[PDB]
Design a protein around this ligand. Structure first.
Ligand SMILES: CCOC(=O)Nc1ccc(NCc2ccc(F)cc2)cc1N
Ligand SMILES: CCOC(=O)Nc1ccc(NCc2ccc(F)cc2)cc1N
Ligand SMILES: [K+]
Ligand SMILES: [K+]
Ligand SMILES: [K+]
Lengths: 354, 146, 354, 146, 354, 354, 146, 146
């Protein structure tokens, strides 16, 4: 079946490059990226009334190439999933197709093909070009980015609220004070809404320049308020950046410990020992041939099941992190064992000599 | 694989070897006594861990419903299949679902409760090893969970 | 009294959702927020001369709804406070009302009602719309944000002062140097005050664009000074952000230790044991029936009071943080106890055999 | 609850059981001797901690004014009410001022200077337990501080 | 001499409030600050041709008040220095005056008085108003800010150098590329120098708006370069901020240890014991009355000098920080002492019984 | 040969100042920097049509001086390389010249000389002035900056990707929403491309001011979107700065440990002992004069080679970092040794007395 | 205070009590022997530290030039005045150059090589204590460095 | 320096002193026995480390091809020259490729497996010391790697 094994190795390699890339497999995904992103850009260049002609021309070719490439990729991935043992036979392939992102990719492809077909309602045929962004959104494996951002935001919720509350009060105050000074002299600050627009555009440090204070009082107040206001607005970015950095550092820290080890290795052993209870040559002897006292072998199996369950638990626990108080715990164990050893010496000296 | 009544009676007969007094429970005394009669030597803390895995009442005993559940289930549950597969993946750095026969042999005989040479020989014989010498452990996990 | 207990549970639930929210109770407070904030926005849209009509219309309805909702909330909270044992009876309700933020909320509500009544001095009836911001200010439970900001600012005083001193010097020098170069060619830099305004608006990175250097010397001098100046102005934000992040991390650190534990549990026990000295069945026996030697039971009570006071202190202390030198202290205790044990062996060997 | 003169004389008679010599002070010797006569066995460090809680002079003694103050006050002070209530709140994760009867029982008999079953039975009987099985501990704290 | 001691306490209090403030003494220095800074502002308002009249009026009064206040402060500080024992008598006062910042303050005061006198060359009388900034520069006690900034910059040299090298390369390349595209269409980019000015003003995120790309190629090229360029330019403000924060945290860390302790206390004792060798009643006895064997007391003194020198060294060393490897060192000492104790038991058992 | 040793010391000093500067040697390199950078600036001033005359004049002199200085420096460095033992004789000098940056410097110099010669195609003679930037690029010793930046970027890949993905989605959305509102009223937002240009220029906080929202709906949407958008755009700069700071701190941490030590010292000793096997006076005796049993000395040498190889390995290993679990390992070793010692006591007591 | 020749001869006579053999050096043997004759009991490590403070040659000895320098200097040097003043400042939190008589007494008798009551009594008598009970320690440092 | 056949035979004769049984391998027994006969006293862990440096098969032995490779190579390889030069550079703070004769003497006799005085005397004699007293260690490394 050497050909069968070559087939299986090819399948596993393709599935590895598609589902979970590593090392050089990226050279594929990046490509796909630059293929969709590029298309997006062209779509935007279609909106300008100056380049519409050439842009539509290029978009025709690019959409054709993209539809062909994504159809090929989809067929290849659906065939590759077969490598794993979970999805075998056409029933298994179907079970694979039922995944959400798979049907998403299929829907996007069928939409692209139907659009290019109807091309031969141009407004809708242009509007659906936004669909490609779903091809990128599909790159998120279970929304990792959203979950990471949410975790980091929640961990610093108290610090973030303080920056917004202090920043909002300064914007409401500085806007009011500057509006009070520029009310009549300058025409820009006709109403309070204009003052608030100016205050936001200034405190964020955007500084469009369509509204600026003209009288000296307004300038002094603006300069004094901007220094206090600019720092509060720029805090969230710094807080979140330091949070991300510290999180990455601590995580990388735990990589060195490698404490889980031994539990995973023992679990496979307890599972093999349990499994082999029912097929090992160790039980294919006249002695074991079950007819007179079946319970003996059943009792031996029951013990292996209990040990398997202990090993599965110890294995699952390894994932959980451990504290730095273990050193105190080993001293407690070491001292207690030694103190008990001196007692056992003391009792024997007192027994013999008295 | 519906649990039949004759299968239940055979589990009951094994359960009664532990609980020879007919009290309907297995403590560390009953469990450890049967084990040492076969030449095993568990510690007290190992006997407590074993009973604790199936003792829902938390009173340090195994009753027949808990015994029957463990025996009917073995490793067939989805939790067992996933955790065993996660254990192999610890030793699969490529992430391709493969492990070398020689690497499996090293881990089985050098870590943990090491397998003997004959144990590990039977284990590598049972996995349908490829011609390269690489083992697809996820189909190895389904054979132990079937 | 099952109905009484249902009543008490309802009261405690309402008081929990109002005073100290957790989990899903937030779904209430957020609502109130979006109800006041929205009103604020409408008030601002009243200032524009274009939308005044529709804005006042919407503000009428929104003020009506807000007054009704806040009256309901206030009555409900005043009734809910009764759940706790501190404020019982109408005297207790009154004691509850005497709180500062409660009277604040009441004053704001009465002001809103009086305003809407006088509506049927419109300038003042518009001016008092600012009052609602107090409804948000009321969300601060004892000014937590101010205290947090003050703590973090005080802890980093030296670096912060260094950033301002270097930043102030650079601003003065750059403004003067650029003014010296742009004095005559450009009309913007007519006086030193204009140069200072330009220098601030540039170094803060706002960049309005109403004043810019025109001669090449000014540009070169402005370019170099701008690069040095921009970093110093943004230094405060980064310092405070890193400070907040590090503080949050270290605080989260101490959460894992949970060292206080045992002291709180023992305090309740010493308090119960002291209390039960005067009501336990253990003292309702012929033996204890006090007539011949009252002092014996009094002495037993005096001992329980002393132990209660020891447990209260140990309980208060647990709140204080503990150092990482405890491991050295346990080794010192462990070594000393063991070294004393070998001495006790040595003395006994020397006693018997000599 | 003004401290009366007869109440002062009864405190004086208890104080004199400790200070049998009439020296006007209670040291670790006098305190620990009376305690061990009743069958208690405090350590020396526990006797020092107890005296230190009321020894303002810092010379390792309790005098009658300090003794009388402790006896008149018991747990009625506001510091005691707050700290006891803070101790319950350690075990109130909901923050609603409630604790389960079964959770109170676990903490009282499994942590610290564990209550006996009979002690904890009297404690749960004395709290007006709700029909659910939840205890409002802040009214439990006022009964011990009254 | 009770009056003498009241005098000395008053002097020490004044000198404490002036030289090294703490707690409430700041309420003085801040005042002086707001007194000089204010003056500065007025000087600037003198430059405008609109407010010159009122500004000069206010500056007259403020300069008068400032000269009087600083003369008073200088006399008070010169008299207060006498409290310490270093500068006693008029020779000591003079020695105090010789300090650099003291003569600086004196020169500034004499300059102010000479200016106000010549007031009754107005250009110079206005130019010297810059002198006041020296009053603030004088607030730096031995240039602490400069040294702190230099330390933090030197510790991070490599990372800071990387940000400038990458940022400079992005600036050159982006300026050239945009100039190549905007060369003919737009008139702003007439020469490469204009492109470089635009590139700096954009990458620093100032964005004046006097130069902007007009053709789409320039716009797309500028948008891509600005995203890469903006992060590198703002990279230094973040590195230095994180550095300051980490430095403050680690420093605060060592404050908790307080490991220096015991050495300072022992040094005073060895110094007192050495000093008392020559005046203690312990040596004023017939026995010590020196005539027959003077060397005995000299030898005793020589030993106390050697111990004093050991204590002074151990005291100076405490200032140096200590590593976290001390726990390993105490285990090494503890294990070695215990292993030697078991040997001493073993040898005695082998001696008696054999 | 005292003159020979003076020669060698001079050579080593020059090579130290050139190849690897330290301390004061920098005073040279900085100079060279200010010599090339200055030239660059002048080149730019040549592009302006106003200063071309004087700029070309100055550039002539500066190019002459620079060519002379760099020729001198190159000859001096090529002669200095001889100090090391690797490159000796003219063959060794040649081997030195074959280095990449050496030939780079030589090519740049020959290009400068050929240009100045052809000066007596001016367009190319101006274009090649860009070459000098290679003189700075040459300051990178094996591209340290690029490698550092790449390491820090790769370590923070997951955090960086989240900021880009969230930021890109906000930019696509805010631009579309603002364009929908400003479509007809304002002429700036004629097409979607204009809205995207505005969105980028706004979110990066550049704020040119050539495009701004005019209707109030657009202003409100711009205000809310910019606050969310500005933080995400500045998130990458915040993450890289904290990363650099943390990396520098941890690196400085390992400097204090100084754990490598002992291995380097032992390696030199094992190498000397091996080397001296074949030349030491210890082997120049009648006993060792090899004729009857040569293998004895060969066996002794084979043992020294094996020990040398053990010492070389232990020396290379020291460079690798070590974990903080060593304390647990020393307790394990210490406890085991002591527990074995009590066993040896127990066995001897049981042997003699029984 | 120029060092005179008679002062040098008196230092020489003390130096010769240590170096009784006339070898011109003081080792731990000579130093420790004289010290124990007076009833002192230094350890070997304390004798090495003492000699190391003045042994410039680093060979574990004190010669007469080193002995004479130490004896002529005592505590009069500026390094001694500064370090002693820095030690007091450890216990001056106000930063005003004052320390309480009672705080000085606590530190002298409870930390380090504790002073006896009589030693510390003489020390507080010698400082010109103010009527409040506060000690200006910088003038105390100049009296020990004079 | 092509390895000649007579040089191979002399290595073989040394190899046979270890492997006296003719088994073609050197274990810790054979290596340590020859070493102790010369009065050396390696530990078992030191004998394992030595064999492990040249045992490619990982079975705890040295065969003749591994022995011959080690003997032919000595320290002449580029890895040896670089690592020895890196070891000197640990003690060259200036970075100029020099080390003082007195500093070399301190490191050789005070760290590691200290050289005796006579060993270190021969080492400093062999380096062509400059008149200042500074040693160019990179030419010292080439003499040991030649
Ligand atoms: C934490 C709240 O935010 C700030 O601390 N803001 C801030 C304060 C000052 C400075 N330095 C420039 C300067 C200082 C004083 C002057 F009088 C004029 C200019 C910069 C910022 N960003
Ligand atoms: C700590 C004080 O603040 C700064 O370090 N400022 C700063 C310095 C340089 C750069 N890199 C761009 C650049 C470098 C060199 C040039 F010649 C032209 C441009 C950016 C900033 N922000
Ligand atoms: K900006
Ligand atoms: K801007
Ligand atoms: K602008």
């Amino acid at each position: 079946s050497a050909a069968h094994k070559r087939y299986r190795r090819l399948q596993n390699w393709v599935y590895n490059v598609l589902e979970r890339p590593r090392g050089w497999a990226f050279v594929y995904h990046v490509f796909i990226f630059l293929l969709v992103f590029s298309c997006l850009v062209l779509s935007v260049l279609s909106t300008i009334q100056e380049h519409q002609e050439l842009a539509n021309e290029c978009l025709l070719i690019l959409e054709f190439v993209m539809i062909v490439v994504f159809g090929l990729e989809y067929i290849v991935r659906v065939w590759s999933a077969g490598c794993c043992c979970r999805y075998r036979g056409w029933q298994g392939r179907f079970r694979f197709a039922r995944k959400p992102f798979c049907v998403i990719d299929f829907i996007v492809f069928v939409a692209s093909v139907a659009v290019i077909a109807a091309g031969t309602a141009t407004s809708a045929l242009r509007s659906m070009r936004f669909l490609q962004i779903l091809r990128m959104v599909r790159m998120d494996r279970r929304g990792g980015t959203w979950k990471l951002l949410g975790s980091v935001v929640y961990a610093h919720s108290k610090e973030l609220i303080t920056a917004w509350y202090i920043g909002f009060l300064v914007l409401i105050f500085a806007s009011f004070l500057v509006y009070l000074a520029e009310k009549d002299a300058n025409s820009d600050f006709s109403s309070y809404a204009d003052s608030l627009w100016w205050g936001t555009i200034t405190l964020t440090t955007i500084g469009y320049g369509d509204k600026t204070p003209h009288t000296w009082l307004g300038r002094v107040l603006a300069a004094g308020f901007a220094l206090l206001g600019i720092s509060f607005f720029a805090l969230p970015a710094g807080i979140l950046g330091s949070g991300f950095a510290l999180k990455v550092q601590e995580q990388h820290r735990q990589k060195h410990f490698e404490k889980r080890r031994m539990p995973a290795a023992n679990l496979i052993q307890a599972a093999w020992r349990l499994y082999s209870t029912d097929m090992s040559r160790a039980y294919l002897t006249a002695t074991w041939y079950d007819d007179i006292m079946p319970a003996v072998k059943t009792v031996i199996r029951s013990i292996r099941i209990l040990k398997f369950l202990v090993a599965k638990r110890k294995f699952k626990e390894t994932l959980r992190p451990y504290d730095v108080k273990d050193v105190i715990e080993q001293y407690s164990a070491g001292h207690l064992d030694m103190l008990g050893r001196i007692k056992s010496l003391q009792t024997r000296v007192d027994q013999i000599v008295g | 694989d519906q649990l039949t009544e004759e299968q239940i009676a055979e589990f009951k007969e094994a359960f009664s070897l532990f609980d020879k007094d007919g009290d309907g429970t297995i403590t560390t005394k009953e469990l450890g006594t049967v084990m040492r009669s076969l030449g095993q030597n568990p510690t007290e803390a190992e006997l407590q861990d074993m009973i604790n895995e199936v003792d829902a009442d938390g009173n340090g005993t195994i009753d027949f419903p808990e015994f029957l559940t463990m025996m009917a289930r073995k490793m067939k549950d989805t939790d067992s299949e996933e955790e065993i597969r996660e254990a192999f993946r610890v030793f699969d750095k490529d992430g391709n679902g493969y492990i070398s026969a020689a690497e499996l042999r090293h881990v089985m005989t050098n870590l943990g409760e090491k397998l003997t040479d004959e144990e590990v020989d039977e284990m590598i014989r049972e996995a349908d090893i490829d011609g390269d010498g690489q083992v697809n452990y996820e189909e190895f996990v389904q054979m132990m969970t079937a």
